[PDB]
Amino acid sequence: NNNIIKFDKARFTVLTEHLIRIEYSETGEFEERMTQMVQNREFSEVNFDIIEKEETIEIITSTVHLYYNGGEFTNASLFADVKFNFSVYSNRWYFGEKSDGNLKGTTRTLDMIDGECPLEDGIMSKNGFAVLADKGKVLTEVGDIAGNSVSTIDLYLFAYGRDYRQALKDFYQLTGNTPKLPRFALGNWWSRYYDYSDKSYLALMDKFTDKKVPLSVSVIDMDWHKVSEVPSRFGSGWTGYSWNKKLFPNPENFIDELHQRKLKVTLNDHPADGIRAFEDPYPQVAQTLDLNTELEEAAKFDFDNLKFRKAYFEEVHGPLEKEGVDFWWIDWQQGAISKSGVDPLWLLNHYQYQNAQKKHKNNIILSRYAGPGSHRYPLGFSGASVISWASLDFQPYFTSTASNIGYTWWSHDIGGHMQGYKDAELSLRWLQFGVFSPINRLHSSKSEFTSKEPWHFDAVIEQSMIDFLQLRHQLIPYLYSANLITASEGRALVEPLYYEYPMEEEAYQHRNQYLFGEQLMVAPITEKMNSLLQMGSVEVWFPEGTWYDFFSGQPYDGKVSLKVYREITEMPVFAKAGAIIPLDKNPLKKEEIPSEIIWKIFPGADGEYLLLEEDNETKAEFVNGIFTVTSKKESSRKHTIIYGEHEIVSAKRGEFSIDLNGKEENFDWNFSTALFRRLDIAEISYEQKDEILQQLSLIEEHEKQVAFIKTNENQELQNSLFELLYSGK
Amino acid sequence: SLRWLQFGVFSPINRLHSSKSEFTSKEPWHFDAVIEQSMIDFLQLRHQLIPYLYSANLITASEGRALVEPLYYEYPMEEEAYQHRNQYLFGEQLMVAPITEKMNSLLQMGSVEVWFPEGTWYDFFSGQPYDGKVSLKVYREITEMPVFAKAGAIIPLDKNPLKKEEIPSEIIWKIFPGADGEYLLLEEDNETKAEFVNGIFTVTSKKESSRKHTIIYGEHEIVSAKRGEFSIDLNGKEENFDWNFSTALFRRLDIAEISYEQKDEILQQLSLIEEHEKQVAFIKTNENQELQNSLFELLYSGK
Amino acid sequence: IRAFEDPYPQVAQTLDLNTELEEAAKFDFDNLKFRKAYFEEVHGPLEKEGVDFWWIDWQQGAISKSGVDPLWLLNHYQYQNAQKKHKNNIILSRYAGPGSHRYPLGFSGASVISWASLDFQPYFTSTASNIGYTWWSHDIGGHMQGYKDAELSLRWLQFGVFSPINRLHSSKSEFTSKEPWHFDAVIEQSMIDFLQLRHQLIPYLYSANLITASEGRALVEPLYYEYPMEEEAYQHRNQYLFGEQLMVAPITEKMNSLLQMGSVEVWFPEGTWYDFFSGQPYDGKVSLKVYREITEMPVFAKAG
Numbered sequence A: 001n002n003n004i005i006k007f008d009k010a011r012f013t014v015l016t017e018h019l020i021r022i023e024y025s026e027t028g029e030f031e032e033r034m035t036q037m038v039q040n041r042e043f044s045e046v047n048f049d050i051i052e053k054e055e056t057i058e059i060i061t062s063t064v065h066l067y068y069n070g071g072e073f074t075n076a077s078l079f080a081d082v083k084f085n086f087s088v089y090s091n092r093w094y095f096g097e098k099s100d101g102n103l104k105g106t107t108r109t110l111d112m113i114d115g116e117c118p119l120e121d122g123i124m125s126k127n128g129f130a131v132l133a134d135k136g137k138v139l140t141e142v143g144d145i146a147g148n149s150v151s152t153i154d155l156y157l158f159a160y161g162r163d164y165r166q167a168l169k170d171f172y173q174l175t176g177n178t179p180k181l182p183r184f185a186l187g188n189w190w191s192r193y194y195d196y197s198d199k200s201y202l203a204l205m206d207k208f209t210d211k212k213v214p215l216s217v218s219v220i221d222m223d224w225h226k227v228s229e230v231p232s233r234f235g236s237g238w239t240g241y242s243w244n245k246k247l248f249p250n251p252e253n254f255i256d257e258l259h260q261r262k263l264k265v266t267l268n269d270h271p272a273d274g275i276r277a278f279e280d281p282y283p284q285v286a287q288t289l290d291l292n293t294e295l296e297e298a299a300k301f302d303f304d305n306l307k308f309r310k311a312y313f314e315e316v317h318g319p320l321e322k323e324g325v326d327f328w329w330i331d332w333q334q335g336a337i338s339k340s341g342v343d344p345l346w347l348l349n350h351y352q353y354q355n356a357q358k359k360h361k362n363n364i365i366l367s368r369y370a371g372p373g374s375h376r377y378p379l380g381f382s383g384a385s386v387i388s389w390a391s392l393d394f395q396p397y398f399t400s401t402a403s404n405i406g407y408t409w410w411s412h413d414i415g416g417h418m419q420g421y422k423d424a425e426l427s428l429r430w431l432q433f434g435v436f437s438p439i440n441r442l443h444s445s446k447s448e449f450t451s452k453e454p455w456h457f458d459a460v461i462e463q464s465m466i467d468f469l470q471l472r473h474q475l476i477p478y479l480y481s482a483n484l485i486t487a488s489e490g491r492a493l494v495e496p497l498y499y500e501y502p503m504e505e506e507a508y509q510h511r512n513q514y515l516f517g518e519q520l521m522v523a524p525i526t527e528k529m530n531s532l533l534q535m536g537s538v539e540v541w542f543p544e545g546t547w548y549d550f551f552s553g554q555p556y557d558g559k560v561s562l563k564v565y566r567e568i569t570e571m572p573v574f575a576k577a578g579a580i581i582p583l584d585k586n587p588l589k590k591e592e593i594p595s596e597i598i599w600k601i602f603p604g605a606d607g608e609y610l611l612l613e614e615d616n617e618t619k620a621e622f623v624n625g626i627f628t629v630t631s632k633k634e635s636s637r638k639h640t641i642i643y644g645e646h647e648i649v650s651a652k653r654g655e656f657s658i659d660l661n662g663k664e665e666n667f668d669w670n671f672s673t674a675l676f677r678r679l680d681i682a683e684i685s686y687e688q689k690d691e692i693l694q695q696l697s698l699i700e701e702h703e704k705q706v707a708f709i710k711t712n713e714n715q716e717l718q719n720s721l722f723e724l725l726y727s728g729k
Numbered sequence B: 001s002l003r004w005l006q007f008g009v010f011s012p013i014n015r016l017h018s019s020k021s022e023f024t025s026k027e028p029w030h031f032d033a034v035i036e037q038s039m040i041d042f043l044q045l046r047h048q049l050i051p052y053l054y055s056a057n058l059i060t061a062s063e064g065r066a067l068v069e070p071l072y073y074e075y076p077m078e079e080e081a082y083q084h085r086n087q088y089l090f091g092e093q094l095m096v097a098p099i100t101e102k103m104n105s106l107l108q109m110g111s112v113e114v115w116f117p118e119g120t121w122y123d124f125f126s127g128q129p130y131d132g133k134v135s136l137k138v139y140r141e142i143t144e145m146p147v148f149a150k151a152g153a154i155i156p157l158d159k160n161p162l163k164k165e166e167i168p169s170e171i172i173w174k175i176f177p178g179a180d181g182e183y184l185l186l187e188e189d190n191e192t193k194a195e196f197v198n199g200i201f202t203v204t205s206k207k208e209s210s211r212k213h214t215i216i217y218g219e220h221e222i223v224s225a226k227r228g229e230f231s232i233d234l235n236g237k238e239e240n241f242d243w244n245f246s247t248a249l250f251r252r253l254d255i256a257e258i259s260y261e262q263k264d265e266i267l268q269q270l271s272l273i274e275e276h277e278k279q280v281a282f283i284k285t286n287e288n289q290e291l292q293n294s295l296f297e298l299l300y301s302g303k
Numbered sequence C: 001i002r003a004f005e006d007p008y009p010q011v012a013q014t015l016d017l018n019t020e021l022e023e024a025a026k027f028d029f030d031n032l033k034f035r036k037a038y039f040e041e042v043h044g045p046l047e048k049e050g051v052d053f054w055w056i057d058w059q060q061g062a063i064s065k066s067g068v069d070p071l072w073l074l075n076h077y078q079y080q081n082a083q084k085k086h087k088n089n090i091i092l093s094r095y096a097g098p099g100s101h102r103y104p105l106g107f108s109g110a111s112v113i114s115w116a117s118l119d120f121q122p123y124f125t126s127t128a129s130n131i132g133y134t135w136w137s138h139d140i141g142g143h144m145q146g147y148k149d150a151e152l153s154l155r156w157l158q159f160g161v162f163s164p165i166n167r168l169h170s171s172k173s174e175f176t177s178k179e180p181w182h183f184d185a186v187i188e189q190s191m192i193d194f195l196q197l198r199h200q201l202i203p204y205l206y207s208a209n210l211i212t213a214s215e216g217r218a219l220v221e222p223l224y225y226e227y228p229m230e231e232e233a234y235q236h237r238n239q240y241l242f243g244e245q246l247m248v249a250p251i252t253e254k255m256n257s258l259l260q261m262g263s264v265e266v267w268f269p270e271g272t273w274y275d276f277f278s279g280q281p282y283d284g285k286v287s288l289k290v291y292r293e294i295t296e297m298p299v300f301a302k303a304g
């Protein structure tokens, strides 16, 4: 109440020094209930100043002057000056107007998108302020829609400057934290829009095992249910709740077989045509909803309706869950229309996520983005992207930017969904990105030609895809720990560079570069390789410090912007001196938590990593060359230590300390080996290869080696050779 | 026309000539004020070089050494001495790399790939330094010619090139710091030896004369119109030319027909970034490939 | 006027601001007391130090309580206030809608430095006479961004000299000074020649100025003012009358390097015309492409 100020028909709540709620009420009553967006307005007390006159009020915090001159809210009556100098004259908010600087957020879907699409604003701005309008309905205490707010205007002014992480934390305090994901969500998912039988689906799952590809999730797409068998008088077979008995004669037994293989099972649900008279559950639903069965009255989709929702969860989903379905893929594409004015997609995500908690702890959905606050209902499902280099090139930027509206669990169709064109290299680059994305779900539309099975491709592509898919399971400990940090501390797994480096202009100029947890920096390659080099490339910004390629140990002295080149089988991922990354030593081994962890240490600085698990916390410390591992609880877990290049300790039990000061710090990576490899794969003249190898071996002074490559007629070859020289300086 | 005259001035004979056209006169004042002034400057330079040329002439006649030598006369075992067709030695003290291609309009500069042999080299005109051995693309405005001298080079010049007199009444001794050197000025009726040994410059002649000697050590005139034989210690005198990275960088960016936003960013980043390797990494990202090469020349000279 | 400013103590006293909370005197040109404090206590001391007139450089939008554009409030009240200390005083400010010609001079602002911007500007300038706004001052040579071309700078200055106002200006770049001696000796000498010509034209300009004020005739007229029934008077966008004695066809395209000359298609009305500079004659009526070296500008005068 000390942090609440009324003036004329407005109410101002100073939630933090940098977050002010702004309300208008014609009725003099202001809204206390939660909304679709807002779950909590309880914040600790803060200091601020007021200048209140007859006709005007000014609220003053450490970061903003908010002015209200009375009357209806207009661009003239309600406005704010930030106490920052990030811009020369973009430091003022005017009610109902847009200002420059917004770093954007996300959008509902990538359905039908070939490359870039427009995004909605987020809460982050380079100029230090953003306004988030609450246009949603009020909730009841139990979380049903209650109707219109009595605050007919309800806004949140964010004035955090470039303290982006704190803005996001306080956003999560206002809108509710992201829930914890279950560990199974972080493994590889198999999905394909393909009319598998029980037999061919299990045969494929057993082929994954034979091929050494680990999976956590078995998606079954819409051909699980009747499609062509639906009489046309009912409409299409898009919506379905009845097994196709030719393909799945015993569904519970088939799901039992996936459960024996330690897979979680989800089915595609297209809800929009509801429960029509041909469906297996229709007799029960018709009885519950008092439908006219002799006129074959449909139970039309109506998620505003309590009785419909109950029948949907209990009598439609319920029997399928009893057969063993673990969680729901809500695949909604039929618009934003409802009686209530609430988006049916929001109603589905809110009510289905809540219903999923009844049968499994920390359960998920898979569904499209439903607006600010819908991060409460993971996972995000971006949908039917066009298969193209342009779509891949948009996706890292899309994924990191989404953290700016707190939606940090986007699952993209890895390799793209539909249409587009075949290029095995595009498929491989997309999988590299997916492995370093929130969720790694392989999926494809209905084409005989778009399977994401590694063995679809040639032996080189296949082996690389298998390697990356195994790496995803090696990363599950790191991902799961980051997941618990999202849930408990409001930190995104994927951060734009500018979260960590807000004052570095280069942190705003590398759209596809991101931080992946706290220990890794990713620069995916999203452009087709230069055939003369047989290598793809990306311009990488290296912050201040010593950086190592995560895979090769190639070093880079920051701060620098440097074009980096990789073969199609290799991905630019970097770790700082002192980085500690845990890996599952046994990624193929079915076990709910790893029996063995590899501690991968990057020499040259102190470091620390906290491994959060379901029932433990394990701290790895690297201080003055001493590596120490301690846990809250004891276990039989065996620890492996890799210090730079070399395995130091193999499968050691319990807590321990070891001195690595007397151990080889340097990786093997060396200029001459790397130079020989780049020249050898290049589709260039042998006389050019001979001369470059000879001259770069003979010329001793680094500045003269660089002068020699500066004369090369191949401009991209110059850049590739320059990367090696820079790493070898 | 201007590039051709630059070459002619550093060729065996500088004879302006043209066929029967009302439009092909080689008079400097045929052209605009910029071209005219540059042509006049080069034509005066030719007469400043007559002492050096005449001495080389007597060396051709008496010792069978050409004034103009291919690089491979001096550097027969260096493959790069066979790969710079238009580069040559001009007497024993100067190495010439004429520009013979129309300028890049985006840079407002012409260029030539120069092979610098082992040693420290200076632009004869600007004092811009180059560490050999290296092959390096060099850029010059249309009024400037790539001519280079080694540390220790001594070049005599006529101080009064316009003055009608059968032999110069005044010689400028132009000394390039950083090494010992020597030059023998052969004339019709004299020989004058200039020696630069452990920072001591000595001038002696076979016969005495009223000739007045001027000494330019790098940048600075040390002695003005001094008669007779003499010695002077230059160890306590400023060795360094004025030429500097920042002034040269500003000039190249300023004449360039490129975006002002690119000029602003290059000047700001190259001033801010302290480590030479990171200044080179910054220019390596430039979308203008020839601008990269021009900036790289400045960075290489400023290393 | 924020709390760090030299005039803030006086403004705070006049407007009863809370100085211990560092309350800003926010810009509010709807407010009589704010306007008075702005003219008397903010501008006033600077005028006492010798400032002759105000460059109002407003780019922060059209929002006010009253629904009056703050730019209109600034131009109306500042032009009126400028008359207090000097006779026939001016401002320099952006266009504020029909009638704002009452508050000269016009300030067109932050043009991109390009051939495209120069090529628009003569047309822009003459067309403005159609809403009576006849004193546009453009940044001569362009304001910001864009690209370097000494010939573009020289052609822009040629136009400026035959425009309502010849104000050299440039944004914050070490590389965009409009000083003639920034350029080579040929460009420098031509720029100096054109800048001296502007002062030679001041008698003609000042006389035209009094004709604008007393008879409502623009200095710069589209061709179709004089030749309303000639279709060619609507087909030469950048050609204009400059007072009553001169017709201008600026060159606004980079020269053809094979000719070492720029060009413009000129419509010559009925009559005998002379190049103002060379005396080259032209028999009207004809449309004729004319060529000039970068140092020369197409300006024409009739017999008599």
Ligand SMILES: *[C@]1(O[C@@H]2[C@@H](O)[C@@H](O)O[C@H](CO)[C@H]2O)O[C@H](CO)[C@@H](O)[C@H](O[C@H]2O[C@H](CO)[C@@H](O)[C@H](O)[C@H]2O)[C@H]1O
Pocket: A112, A192, A193, A221, A222, A268, A331, A333, A383, A384, A418, A444, A445, A446, A447
């Ligand atoms: C794609 O699906 C179409 C079908 O609509 C139908 O026409 O058969 C086609 C094959 O011959 C098939 O390509 O296009 C539609 C319209 O854009 C999308 O709605 C489909 O995506 C969604 O549904 C799929 C099936 O459940 C699912 O795999 C996707 O993840 C959904 O986004 C798309 O596959």
Ligand SMILES: *[C@]1(O[C@@H]2[C@@H](O)[C@@H](O)O[C@H](CO)[C@H]2O)O[C@H](CO)[C@@H](O)[C@H](O[C@H]2O[C@H](CO)[C@@H](O)[C@H](O)[C@H]2O)[C@H]1O
Pocket: B018, B019, B020, B021
């Ligand atoms: C050039 O001379 C021709 C003349 O032959 C004659 O036809 O008049 C022409 C002008 O309308 C003129 O261009 O071509 C010939 C044939 O190739 C050359 O022999 C001339 O060069 C020589 O003679 C010139 C006159 O003495 C002299 O200046 C040159 O140095 C000579 O090589 C050439 O000018």
Ligand SMILES: *[C@]1(O[C@@H]2[C@@H](O)[C@@H](O)O[C@H](CO)[C@H]2O)O[C@H](CO)[C@@H](O)[C@H](O[C@H]2O[C@H](CO)[C@@H](O)[C@H](O)[C@H]2O)[C@H]1O
Pocket: A088, C057, C059, C109, C110, C144, C170, C171, C172, C173
């Ligand atoms: C230009 O000014 C920007 C500044 O805003 C700041 O970012 O510094 C830059 C240089 O590093 C500089 O280029 O761009 C802005 C935004 O478009 C304009 O508002 C500026 O023009 C106005 O202000 C100038 C300074 O008073 C003035 O010279 C112009 O006449 C004004 O239009 C522009 O220069």
